[PDB]
Structures are given as C-alpha cells and as structure tokens.
Amino acid sequence: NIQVVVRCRPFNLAERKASAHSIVECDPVRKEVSVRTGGLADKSSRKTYTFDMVFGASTKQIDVYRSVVCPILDEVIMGYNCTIFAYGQTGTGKTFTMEGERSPNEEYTWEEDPLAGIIPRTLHQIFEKLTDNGTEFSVKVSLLEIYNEELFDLLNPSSDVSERLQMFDDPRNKRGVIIKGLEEITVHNKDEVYQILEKGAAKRTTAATLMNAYSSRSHSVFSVTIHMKETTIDGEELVKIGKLNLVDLAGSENNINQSLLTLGRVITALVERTPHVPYRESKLTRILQDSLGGRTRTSIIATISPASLNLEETLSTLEYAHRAKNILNK
Numbered sequence: 179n180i181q182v183v184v185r186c187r188p189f190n191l192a193e194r195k196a197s198a199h200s201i202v203e204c205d206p207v208r209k210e211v212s213v214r215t216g217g218l219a220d221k222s223s224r225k226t227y228t229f230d231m232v233f234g235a236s237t238k239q240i241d242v243y244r245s246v247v248c249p250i251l252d253e254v255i256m257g258y259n260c261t262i263f264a265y266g267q268t269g270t271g272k273t274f275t276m277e278g279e280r281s282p283n284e285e286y287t288w289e290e291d292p293l294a295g296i297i298p299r300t301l302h303q304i305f306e307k308l309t310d311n312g313t314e315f316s317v318k319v320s321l322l323e324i325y326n327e328e329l330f331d332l333l334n335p336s337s338d339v340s341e342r343l344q345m346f347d348d349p350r351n352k353r354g355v356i357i358k359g360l361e362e363i364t365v366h367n368k369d370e371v372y373q374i375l376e377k378g379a380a381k382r383t384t385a386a387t388l389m390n391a392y393s394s395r396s397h398s399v400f401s402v403t404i405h406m407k408e409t410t411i412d413g414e415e416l417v418k419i420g421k422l423n424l425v426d427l428a429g430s431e432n433n434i435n436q437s438l439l440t441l442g443r444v445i446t447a448l449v450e451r452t453p454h455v456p457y458r459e460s461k462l463t464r465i466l467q468d469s470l471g472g473r474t475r476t477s478i479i480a481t482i483s484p485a486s487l488n489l490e491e492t493l494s495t496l497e498y499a500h501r502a503k504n505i506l507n508k
C-alpha cells in the first residue's frame with residue numbers, strides 16, 4: 179500500500195572534477211537500484227533493491243511531478259487526503275525534490291523554472307486546474323516545522339520564528355492534533371504564491387541563525403488545503419475538501435532527533451504487524467499519524483547519492499525505504 183520511489187542525484191561538481199566512481203546504478207525500467215558494496219568495476223559484490231519506481235541522475239523535476247505528484251494531486255482534488263515524504267541523507271536532494279530551486283541569472287519566472295520542485299509546481303497546477311473547470315474553490319497553506327521536538331510556523335508574517343506553537347490532542351476527532359496558533363494562509367490567486375514562499379524562505383533564514391544545523395535537523399510540513407464547492411453543468415454542487423501534506427524530513431544521517439527515531443520505530447511496528455505503534459512518542463508521528471497506517475494515501479521518495487563515500491548511508495536509506503513498501507493504509 180504505501181508507495182516508495184527512489185531518486186538518485188548526479189555527482190556534484192565536487193565529485194565531478196574529483197573524477198570519482200559511482201557505486202550506485204539506477205534502472206528505471208527495472209524499478210531497481212543496485213549498490214556496489216565491494217570493489218573493482220571488473221568484479222564486484224553488490225546490493226540490489228526493488229521499488230515502485232526509481233529515477234536516475236538524468237531525471238528532471240517535471241519528470242518527477244508528472245510521474246508521482248500529478249496522480250496524488252488528482253486524488254486530493256477528489257476530496258481525499260494525501261502525503262508525500264522526502265527521506266534520506268543530507269545533501270542528496272530532499273529539498274531539491276520538494277521545493278526545487280531557481281535557475282540562475284533571473285532566466286525564468288517562478289512558474290516556468292525547470293528547477294522548481296514539488297511544492298511550487300503543485301500550487302501552480304491547483305489554480306491551473308480548478309480555475310478552468312467550473313468550481314468555486316479555496317486554497318489554504320501551512321508550513322509547520324519541527325526542530326528539537328519544538329513546533330514552529332514559518333509562514334506567519336506577524337510572529338517571529340522564536341515563538342513555538344503548542345500541540346494538544348483534538349477532543350473531537352481522536353488521533354488528531356490541534357496546533358494552537360498555526361496560521362493558515364489563504365492563497366487568493368496563482369500570482370500570489372511566490373510571495374507566500376519568499377516569506378517562508380526568509381523566515382527559515384532567521385530560524386537558521388537561531389538554531390544549529392537547522393536546515394538539516396528540522397522536519398518541515400508544507401500543507402495545502404483545498405475547499406471546492408464544485409457545480410458541474412448539471413448544477414450539482416459537490417462540496418469537496420482535499421488536503422495534501424508535503425514533508426521534507428530531517429537528514430537520516432547519524433544530538434538525537436526524537437521524531438526521526440520515532441518515525442522508523444513507527445514504521446517497524448506497522449510492517450512487523452505489532453499491535454502498539456508509537457505514534458505519540460514524537461511530534462512528527464502524532465501530527466502525521468494518519469499518513470502512517472491511517473486513511474491518508476502516502477508515498478515516500480528516498481534520496482541517495484551515487485558517491486562511494488556515502489555507501490553506509492545509502493544502504494541505510496535503501497533498506498529503510500524498502501521495508502516501508504510493506505506498510506498498508508488507506
């Protein structure tokens with residue numbers, strides 16, 4: 179049930195000029211990734227895994243979006259709940275994947291940059307889709323980040339990143355949480371997106387001066403909520419609410435990250451079919467507990483490096499990603 183894809187990034191200019199050796203080969207037609215744990219490219223021992231989809235170094239953002247996100251966006255628009263996670267070591271591409279970057283020299287606008295990642299392609303698509311069709315809809319967004327088991331709002335322009343939100347259980351619906359103070363921002367039109375993100379990109383900067391290795395050690399939850407009051411030609415007014423959470427996890431490398439530790443432990447309990455799952459043992463797992471064995475539809479995108487220095491981290495990721503394939507939800 180939980181879909182897992184592996185994205186492998188190309189050798190960085192640091193490993194480019196250093197003219198090194200790939201220990202990872204990604205076969206998109208075989209949905210398989212293979213790591214060389216031994217030696218010699220003439221004779222080598224290897225480790226091989228199979229996923230739902232693998233994308234090699236030559237994969238572009240649009241490729242990823244078209245293949246994995248687009249189908250999740252369609253389910254969300256229908257009124258369902260979906261979740262996407264980016265898992266993996268630091269410096270392998272979790273952020274390039276969920277956010278993407280800007281092509282240099284102001285070459286493109288935000289909506290056409292080949293480098294844009296999931297989050298911005300999605301926000302744009304939403305408008306591009308519902309706007310056409312005859313629907314009254316509304317988009318809300320939230321960016322909730324976890325650093326050291328403390329909760330932060332990176333979108334609220336009124337309060338600074340030094341003020342942590344509180345989390346309490348939701349008396350109404352069980353297994354839900356209430357985040358006191360989280361700002362939900364309404365995005366009135368496409369040409370109103372980029373600023374919302376620029377503010378986020380700004381506030382995360384101060385968050386970095388305030389907390390060590392923030393960008394590595396924090397988990398961000400980008401949530402977009404769609405309220406659609408559709409009315410097809412028939413004049414049928416369907417009231418749909420779709421929610422999508424885009425999660426860029428802290429770096430899987432190895433103080434302690436209670437949520438990352440709790441995530442893996444939660445995954446274990448679900449694959450090992452154990453009755454007790456430690457959702458409550460971290461903020462991340464309690465917040466997104468429905469994405470993990472609940473009724474949300476979830477995908478994981480693990481990110482790895484071709485580099486041989488990363489061997490250990492790559493097998494740790496490939497492996498962690500592999501077992502999750504066994505989590506069944508919806």
Ligand SMILES: CC(=O)C1=NN2c3cc(F)ccc3OC[C@H]2[C@@]1(CCCN1CCN(C(C)=O)CC1)c1ccccc1
Pocket residue numbers: 276277278279280288289291293294295297298321332372374375376377378379400
């Ligand atoms: C304002 C801006 O340029 C951008 N803001 N982003 C952003 C902020 C956020 F709260 C949540 C999701 C996001 O997702 C998207 C990125 C990004 C770009 C990320 C730019 N980075 C921050 C600055 N950087 C450095 C190293 O200075 C590189 C990474 C983008 C936006 C639209 C189209 C393409 C790319």
Ligand SMILES: Nc1ncnc2c1ncn2[C@@H]1O[C@H](COP(=O)(O)OP(=O)(O)O)[C@@H](O)[C@H]1O
Pocket residue numbers: 186187188190235266267268269270271272273274275481
């Ligand atoms: N698939 C890719 N193609 C090109 N550059 C990539 C790719 N994946 C990651 N990068 C780059 O490698 C670096 C690390 O990316 P980053 O998104 O910060 O990963 P992480 O968030 O896991 O640390 C950045 O320089 C980004 O440009």
Ligand SMILES: [Mg+2]
Pocket residue numbers: 272273393394
């Ligand atoms: Mg990052």
